Amino acid sequence: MNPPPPETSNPNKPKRQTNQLQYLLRVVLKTLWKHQFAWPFQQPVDAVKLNLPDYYKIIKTPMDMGTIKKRLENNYYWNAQECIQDFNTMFTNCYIYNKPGDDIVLMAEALEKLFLQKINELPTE
Numbered sequence: 340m341n342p343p344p345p346e347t348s349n350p351n352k353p354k355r356q357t358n359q360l361q362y363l364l365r366v367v368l369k370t371l372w373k374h375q376f377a378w379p380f381q382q383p384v385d386a387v388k389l390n391l392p393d394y395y396k397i398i399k400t401p402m403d404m405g406t407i408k409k410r411l412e413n414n415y416y417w418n419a420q421e422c423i424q425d426f427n428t429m430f431t432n433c434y435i436y437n438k439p440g441d442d443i444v445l446m447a448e449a450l451e452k453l454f455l456q457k458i459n460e461l462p463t464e
């Protein structure tokens with residue numbers, strides 16, 4: 340059964356736009372989105388649809404690139420490190436819910452490498 344998805348707006352949280360956050364949307368997220376292994380990570384896990392009633396019994400801080408995309412579009416984040424933390428949470432959730440060698444884990448591993456390649460150098464202020 341599904342919890343509400345993570346928030347993509349929060350009016351008591353201050354917003355910011357930075358060159359690095361713009362890059363995280365235009366380059367990092369929008370490029371990873373197109374990778375052949377991106378599809379599991381483009382939306383919150385629908386545990387009812389996928390018949391994973393344990394998913395949210397294990398994963399307590401869910402995160403996905405659909406949520407990240409919407410947060411970037413809303414200027415939800417204060418800085419690039421906050422957004423990077425959401426990507427890292429998404430990858431780590433996959434490793435936590437699954438185990439080494441699983442197909443979904445191989446997909447996350449490849450996407451994580453591409454993510455790190457792209458954030459290795461960010462634009463400056």
Ligand SMILES: CN1C(=O)c2cccc3c2C1=Cc1cccnc1N3Cc1cccc(C(N)=O)c1
Pocket residue numbers: 378379380384389432433436437442443
């Ligand atoms: C983030 N996420 C998981 O952690 C996870 C664990 C098991 C199953 C899924 C996911 C998943 C996202 C997901 C999104 C859309 C449709 N289905 C999803 N699936 C199907 C799948 C993907 C790859 C391999 C298998 C398999 N068991 O071979 C099954």
